Amino acid sequence: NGPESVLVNTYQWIIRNWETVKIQWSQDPTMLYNKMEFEPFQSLVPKAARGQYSGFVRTLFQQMRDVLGTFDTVQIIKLLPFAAAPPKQSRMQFSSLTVNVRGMRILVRGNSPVFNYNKATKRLTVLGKDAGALTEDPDEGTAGVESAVLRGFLILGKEDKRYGPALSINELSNLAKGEKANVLIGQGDVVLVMKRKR
């Protein structure tokens, strides 16, 4: 009882109700974001981060709506509870989002100890406990273009030496619209990104 249970139950709820969440996420996201079911999760989020995280995630979700062929079920499920605060817009980038449990990090890209989706089995494991199983979705984007990781950017694929040494996530704000660059996105992973034109 406490944080860990709120975390696990929140994601359990999303998975249980995925079909209606998916509909609302696409047709009326504001009302999805305003559901009472996300309030307990929001209390886990550091008070001073809630607005920042919401602005960030809401923009990442609109990028996914705006950039055809980049639908990512697991990414939507992972980031959704963070959209539930009144958004505070900024130019900050986040590689992880913190929930306070016992100060734990949910990685924005890929799996983490806290949030682990097992593709082979379709099971989501949160804090080592079962949150439920997904089903294969035909709407899933297969281009390897990731639209909901960086605010204002698309991840294109592997590092490409034509575009020079890798930048940190804090160093992307000088890039021109349409410009490409390599980025230390996390771990030791370097990826080619593009700054969006709109």
Author numbering: 540 to 641, 644 to 739
What does the paper say about this structure?
Viral determinants of virulence and transmissibility are still poorly understood, although lysine at position 627 of the polymerase subunit PB2 (PB2-627K) is now known to be important for avian influenza virus adaptation to mammals. Here, we report that a basic amino acid at position 591 of PB2 can compensate for the lack of PB2-627K and allows efficient replication of highly pathogenic H5N1 and pandemic H1N1 viruses in mammalian species. Our data indicated that a basic amino acid at PB2-591 can compensate for PB2-627K in mammalian adaptation; interestingly, these two residues are positioned near each other on the surface of PB2.
For comparison, we also present the crystal structure of the C-terminal portion of an H5N1 PB2 protein encoding PB2-627K (A/Vietnam/1203/04). The PB2 protein of the pandemic H1N1 virus shows an altered polar surface when compared to the avian H5N1 PB2-627K protein. The basic amino acid at position 591 fills a distinctive cleft found in the PB2 proteins of H5N1 viruses. In particular, the side chains of R591 and S590 in the structure of H1N1 PB2 occupy what would otherwise be the positively charged cleft in the H5N1 PB2. Our finding that PB2-591Q/627K (found in human viruses) and PB2-591R/627E (found in pandemic H1N1 viruses) adopt different conformations (i.e. a positively charged, ‘cleft’ vs. a positively-charged residue that fills the cleft and is located next to a negatively-charged patch) probably favors the former possibility, since it is less likely that they would both enhance interaction with the same host protein, but the positive charge introduced by either change could easily disrupt interaction with an inhibitory host protein.
